[PDB]
CSV table of C-alpha atoms in Angstrom, one decimal:
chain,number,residue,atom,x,y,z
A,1,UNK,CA,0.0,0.0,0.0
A,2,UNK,CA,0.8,3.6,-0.2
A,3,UNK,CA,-0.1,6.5,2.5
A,4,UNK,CA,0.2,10.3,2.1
A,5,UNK,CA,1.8,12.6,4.4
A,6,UNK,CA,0.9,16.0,4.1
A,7,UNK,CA,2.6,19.1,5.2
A,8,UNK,CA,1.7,21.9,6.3
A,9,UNK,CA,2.7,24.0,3.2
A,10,UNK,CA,-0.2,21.4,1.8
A,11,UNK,CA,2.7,19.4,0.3
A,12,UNK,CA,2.1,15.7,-0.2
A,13,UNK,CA,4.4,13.0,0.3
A,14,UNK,CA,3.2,9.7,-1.5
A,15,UNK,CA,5.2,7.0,0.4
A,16,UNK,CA,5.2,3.4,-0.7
A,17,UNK,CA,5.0,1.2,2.6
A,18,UNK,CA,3.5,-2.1,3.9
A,19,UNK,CA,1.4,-2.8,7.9
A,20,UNK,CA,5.0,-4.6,8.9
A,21,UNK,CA,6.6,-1.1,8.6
A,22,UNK,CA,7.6,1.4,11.5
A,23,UNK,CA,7.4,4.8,12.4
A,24,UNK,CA,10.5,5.5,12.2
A,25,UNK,CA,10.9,3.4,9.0
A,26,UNK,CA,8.1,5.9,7.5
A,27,UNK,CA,10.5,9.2,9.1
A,28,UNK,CA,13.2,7.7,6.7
A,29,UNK,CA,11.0,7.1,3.9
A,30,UNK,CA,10.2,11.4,4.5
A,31,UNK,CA,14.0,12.3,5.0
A,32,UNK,CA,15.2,10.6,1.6
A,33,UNK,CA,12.9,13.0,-0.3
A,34,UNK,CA,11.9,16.2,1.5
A,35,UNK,CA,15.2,16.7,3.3
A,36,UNK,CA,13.5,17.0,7.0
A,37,UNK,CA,15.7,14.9,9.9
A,38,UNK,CA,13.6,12.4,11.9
A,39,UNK,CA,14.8,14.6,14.7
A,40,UNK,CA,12.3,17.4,14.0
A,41,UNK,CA,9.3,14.7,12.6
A,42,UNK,CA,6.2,14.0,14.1
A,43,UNK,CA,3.9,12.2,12.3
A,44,UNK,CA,0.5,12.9,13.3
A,45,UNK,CA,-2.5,10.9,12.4
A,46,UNK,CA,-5.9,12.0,13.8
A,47,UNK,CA,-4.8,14.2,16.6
A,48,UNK,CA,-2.7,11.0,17.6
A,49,UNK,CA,0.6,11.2,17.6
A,50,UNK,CA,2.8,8.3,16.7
A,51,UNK,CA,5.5,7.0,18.7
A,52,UNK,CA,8.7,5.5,17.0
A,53,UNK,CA,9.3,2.2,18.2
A,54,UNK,CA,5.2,0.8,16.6
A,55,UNK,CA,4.2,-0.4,13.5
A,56,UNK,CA,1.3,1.4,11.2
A,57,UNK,CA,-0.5,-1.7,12.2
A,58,UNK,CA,-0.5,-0.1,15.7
A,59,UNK,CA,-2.2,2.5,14.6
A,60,UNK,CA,-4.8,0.4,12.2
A,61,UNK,CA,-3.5,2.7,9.5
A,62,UNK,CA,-5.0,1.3,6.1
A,63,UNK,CA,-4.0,1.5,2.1
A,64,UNK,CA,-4.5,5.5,0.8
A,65,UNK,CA,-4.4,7.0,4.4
A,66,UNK,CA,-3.3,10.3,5.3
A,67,UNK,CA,-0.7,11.3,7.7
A,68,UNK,CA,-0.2,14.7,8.6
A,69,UNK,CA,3.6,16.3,9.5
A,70,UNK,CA,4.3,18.6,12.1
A,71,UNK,CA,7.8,20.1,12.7
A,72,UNK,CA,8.7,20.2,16.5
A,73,UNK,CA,8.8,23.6,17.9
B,1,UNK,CA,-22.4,31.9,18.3
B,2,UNK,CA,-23.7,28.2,18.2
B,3,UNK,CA,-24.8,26.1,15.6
B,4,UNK,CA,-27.4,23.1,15.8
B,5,UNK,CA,-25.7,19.4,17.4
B,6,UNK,CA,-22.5,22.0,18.8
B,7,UNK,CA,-22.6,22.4,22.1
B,8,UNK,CA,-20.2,24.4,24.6
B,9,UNK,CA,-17.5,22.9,26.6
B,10,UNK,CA,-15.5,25.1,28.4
B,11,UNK,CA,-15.2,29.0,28.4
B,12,UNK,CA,-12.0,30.6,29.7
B,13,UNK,CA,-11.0,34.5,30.0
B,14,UNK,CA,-7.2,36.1,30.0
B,15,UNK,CA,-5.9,34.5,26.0
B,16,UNK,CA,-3.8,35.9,23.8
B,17,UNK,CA,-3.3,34.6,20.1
B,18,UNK,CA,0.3,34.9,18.7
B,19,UNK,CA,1.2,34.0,15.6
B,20,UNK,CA,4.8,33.0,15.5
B,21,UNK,CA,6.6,34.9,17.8
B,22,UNK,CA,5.3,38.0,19.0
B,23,UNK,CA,6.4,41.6,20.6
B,24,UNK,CA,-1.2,39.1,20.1
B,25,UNK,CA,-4.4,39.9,21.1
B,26,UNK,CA,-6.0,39.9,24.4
B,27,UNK,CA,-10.3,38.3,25.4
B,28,UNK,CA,-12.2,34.8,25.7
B,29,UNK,CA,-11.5,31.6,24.0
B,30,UNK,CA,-14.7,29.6,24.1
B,31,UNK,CA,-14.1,26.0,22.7
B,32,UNK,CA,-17.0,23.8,22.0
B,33,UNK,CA,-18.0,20.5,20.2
B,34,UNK,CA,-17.2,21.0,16.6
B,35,UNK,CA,-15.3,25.2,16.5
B,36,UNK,CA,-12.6,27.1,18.5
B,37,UNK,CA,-14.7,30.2,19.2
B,38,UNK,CA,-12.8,33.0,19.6
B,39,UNK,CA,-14.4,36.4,20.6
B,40,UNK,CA,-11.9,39.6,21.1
B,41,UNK,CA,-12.2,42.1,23.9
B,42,UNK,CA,-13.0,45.1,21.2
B,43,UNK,CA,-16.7,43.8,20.4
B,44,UNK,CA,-17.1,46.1,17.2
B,45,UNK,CA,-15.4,43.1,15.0
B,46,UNK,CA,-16.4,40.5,18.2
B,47,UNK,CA,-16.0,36.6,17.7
B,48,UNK,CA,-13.9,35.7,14.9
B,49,UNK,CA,-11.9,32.4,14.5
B,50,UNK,CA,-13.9,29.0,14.5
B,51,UNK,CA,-11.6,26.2,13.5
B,52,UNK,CA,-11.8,22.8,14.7
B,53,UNK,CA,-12.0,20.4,12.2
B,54,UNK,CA,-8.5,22.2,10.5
B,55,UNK,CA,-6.7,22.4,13.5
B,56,UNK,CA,-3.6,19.8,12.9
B,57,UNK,CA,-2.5,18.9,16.3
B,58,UNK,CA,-2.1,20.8,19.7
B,59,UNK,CA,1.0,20.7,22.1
B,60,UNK,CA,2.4,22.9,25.2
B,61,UNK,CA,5.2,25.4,24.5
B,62,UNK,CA,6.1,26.3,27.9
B,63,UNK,CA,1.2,28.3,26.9
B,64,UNK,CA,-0.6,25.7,24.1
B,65,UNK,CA,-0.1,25.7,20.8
B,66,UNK,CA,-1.9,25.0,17.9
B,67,UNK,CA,-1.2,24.2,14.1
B,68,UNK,CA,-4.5,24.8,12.5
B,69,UNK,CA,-3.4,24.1,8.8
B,70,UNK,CA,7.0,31.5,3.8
B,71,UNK,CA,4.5,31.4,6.6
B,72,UNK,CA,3.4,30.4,10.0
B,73,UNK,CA,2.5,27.3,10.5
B,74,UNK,CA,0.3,28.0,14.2
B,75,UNK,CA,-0.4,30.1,16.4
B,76,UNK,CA,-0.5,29.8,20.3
B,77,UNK,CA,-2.6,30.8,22.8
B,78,UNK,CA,-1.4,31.8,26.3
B,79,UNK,CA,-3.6,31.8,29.6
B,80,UNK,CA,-2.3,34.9,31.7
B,81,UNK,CA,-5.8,33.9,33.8
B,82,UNK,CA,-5.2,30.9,35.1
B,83,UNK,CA,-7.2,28.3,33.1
B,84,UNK,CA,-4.7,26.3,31.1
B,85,UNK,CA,-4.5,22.6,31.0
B,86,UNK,CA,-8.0,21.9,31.9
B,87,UNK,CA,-8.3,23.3,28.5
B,88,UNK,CA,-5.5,21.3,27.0
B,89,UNK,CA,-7.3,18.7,28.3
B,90,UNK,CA,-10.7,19.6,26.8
B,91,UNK,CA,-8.9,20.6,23.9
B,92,UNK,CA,-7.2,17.8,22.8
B,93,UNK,CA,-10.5,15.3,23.5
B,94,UNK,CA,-12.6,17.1,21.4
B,95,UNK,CA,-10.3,18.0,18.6
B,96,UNK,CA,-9.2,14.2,17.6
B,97,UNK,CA,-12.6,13.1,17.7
B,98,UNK,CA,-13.5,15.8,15.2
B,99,UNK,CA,-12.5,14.0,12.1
């Protein structure tokens, strides 16, 4: 499957990923085409925020979702 | 200022809306079911903002912030009346359920 992660310049990141894939996994996908370090990432996903070391399927994150990103203060 | 299935939630006095940084504006932040009622203390232009359903994701500077989508991303709200964090609180359960 493939989610989107959407900035807040209303920029959208179409990332390529499977359930089995991790947070942090997904923070890499971001870095090796927008530039951003995982450092300042925070994937948000219906207010939720999600926490590195758990899977999409965690979260129950299904094919064509959309993930938001919000650069730490 | 409320519309039919939105009820109130929690009224609080003393905010001040900054953009980014700021050398804001002072009056009541009302939140409620479904907006993020904002009315200023100069009523000629009174009640402006509403929100909630935009609003990105919410976090505490030091004051809570929140990124409602070259420019500024949020804008944060600071409780000089005490009244903060039972409005984080209120603010974050109502927002994520307001998909």
């Amino acid at each position: 499957m493939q989610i989107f992660v959407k900035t807040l310049t209303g920029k959208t990141i179409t990332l390529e990923v499977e359930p089995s894939d991790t947070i942090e996994n997904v923070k890499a996908k971001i870095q090796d085409k927008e530039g951003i370090p995982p450092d300042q990432q925070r994937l948000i996903f219906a207010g939720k925020q999600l926490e590195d070391g758990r899977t999409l399927s965690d979260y129950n994150i299904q094919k064509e979702s959309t993930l938001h990103l919000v650069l730490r203060l | 200022l409320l519309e039919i299935n939105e009820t109130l939630v929690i009224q609080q006095r003393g905010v001040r809306v900054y953009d980014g940084e700021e050398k804001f504006d002072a009056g009541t932040l009302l939140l409620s079911t479904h907006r993020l009622i904002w009315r200023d203390q100069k009523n000629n232009e009174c009640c402006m903002a509403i929100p909630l359903s935009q609003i990105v994701f919410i976090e505490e500077q030091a004051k809570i912030v929140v990124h409602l989508h070259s420019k500024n991303s949020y804008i944060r709200l600071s409780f000089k009346e005490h009244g903060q964090i039972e409005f984080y609180r209120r603010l974050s359960e109502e927002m994520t359920q307001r998909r």
